[PDB]
């Protein structure tokens, strides 16, 4: 193992610890593409968890400076201020692939803002948030999962990312509430007459279910539109991205089967992930 393999192995460990679904699917990419995905992912993860290190933007400002050093001088040695293992790996990827740095900056700006969180007044603000924390991630992965990126490739990756975030929001309603976060928009909560604290306390009901299903239908429609444009991606990545998306979509059925419970995190068993892989690998 060289020092660089060690950096990537660490990025892998962070990815697999935070998301078994994404690890499951993306670890199936050819070696050079999955290593790049591990590093990009670990960077995004570090950004998402930065504020809780001291309870300051300290660590986040450092990650940002680190990324900026890479963008400005990709072939210079840098003494990284945040997580060296991860930044050495991202710099390594950046020397071989085109990275959309502005997308990492958008993600960083979204996390900064999240320190002064206030509920979304409208669905447009919620979707803006989905772009920021996850559409951005699809953007940064785009050059890795495609032969020749076009605006379409980014469009699709972005849409997929936003759909997956909406699916996460839908799986995590109860846990997010405990952390004082509600992502459904005030517009929509009022329309459907839903009060999340009331539901967390008294259980689901038809209003809540209807509102939850209104968002799930948005996620599902966006998923199919992405599936119909799966070809923008390289041949080896197509089936992997399909598995990633299916494994994540399945979370919706899991939530339903648990009666939209707001008191536990549902999941797609590892055995079901292998079943979906069987299905997908059958058409590829």
259's torsion region: left (phi>0), alpha (psi -120 to 50) or beta? left
Binding residues for Mg(2+): 48, 52, 168, 172
CA distance 160 to 219: 9
Q: What is the DSSP string of 176-221?
A: HHHTT---S-HHHHHHTT--HHHHHHH---HHHHHHHHHHHHHHHH
Binding residues: 18-21, 41, 45, 48, 52, 165, 168, 171-172, 248
With a CB cutoff of 8 Å and minimum separation 6, the contacts of 220 are 249, 252
Binding residues for (2E,6E)-farnesyl diphosphate: 18-21, 41, 45, 165, 171, 248
Question: Are residues 85 and 6 in contact, defined by beta-carbon separation less than 8 angstroms?
Answer: yes
| Backbone torsions φ then ψ of 101, nearest 5 degrees | -55, -40
CA distance 88 to 253: 39
CA distance 37 to 23: 10
Residue 53 in 3-state DSSP?
coil
Element (H, E) at 24: helix 20-26
Nearest Cα to Cα of residue 162 among 185, 115, 129, 189: 129
What's the CA angle centered on 130, arms 209 and 138, to 5 degrees? 125
């Amino acid at each position: 193992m060289t020092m660089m393999d060690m950096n990537f192995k660490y990025c892998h460990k962070i990815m697999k610890k935070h998301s078994k679904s994404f690890s499951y699917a993306f670890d199936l990419l050819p070696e050079d593409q999955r290593k790049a995905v591990w590093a990009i992912y670990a960077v995004c993860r570090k950004i998402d968890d930065s504020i809780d290190v001291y309870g300051d933007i300290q660590f986040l400002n450092q990650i940002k400076e680190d990324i900026q050093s890479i963008e400005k001088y990709p072939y210079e040695y840098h003494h990284f201020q945040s997580d060296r293992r991860i930044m050495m790996a991202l710099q390594h990827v950046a020397q071989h692939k085109n990275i959309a740095f502005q997308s990492f900056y958008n993600l960083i700006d979204t996390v900064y803002k999240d320190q002064h969180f206030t509920m979304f007044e409208t669905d447009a603000e919620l979707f803006g948030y989905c772009y920021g924390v996850a559409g951005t991630v699809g953007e940064v992965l785009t050059p890795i999962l495609s032969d020749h990126e076009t605006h379409q490739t980014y469009d699709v990756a972005r849409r997929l990312g936003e759909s997956l975030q909406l699916i996460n929001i839908l799986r995590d309603v109860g846990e997010d509430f405990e952390n004082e976060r509600i992502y459904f928009s005030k517009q929509r909560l009022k329309q459907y007459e839903v009060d999340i604290a009331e539901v967390y306390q008294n259980g689901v009901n038809n209003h809540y279910i209807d509102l939850w299903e209104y968002y799930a239908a948005i996620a599902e429609k966006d998923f199919r539109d992405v599936m119909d444009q799966i070809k923008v991606f390289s041949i080896e990545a197509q089936p992997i991205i399909e598995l990633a998306a299916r494994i994540y979509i399945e979370i919706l059925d899991e939530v339903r089967q648990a009666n939209y419970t707001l008191h536990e995190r549902v999941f797609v068993e590892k055995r079901k992930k292998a079943k979906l892989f069987h299905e997908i690998n059958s058409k590829y």
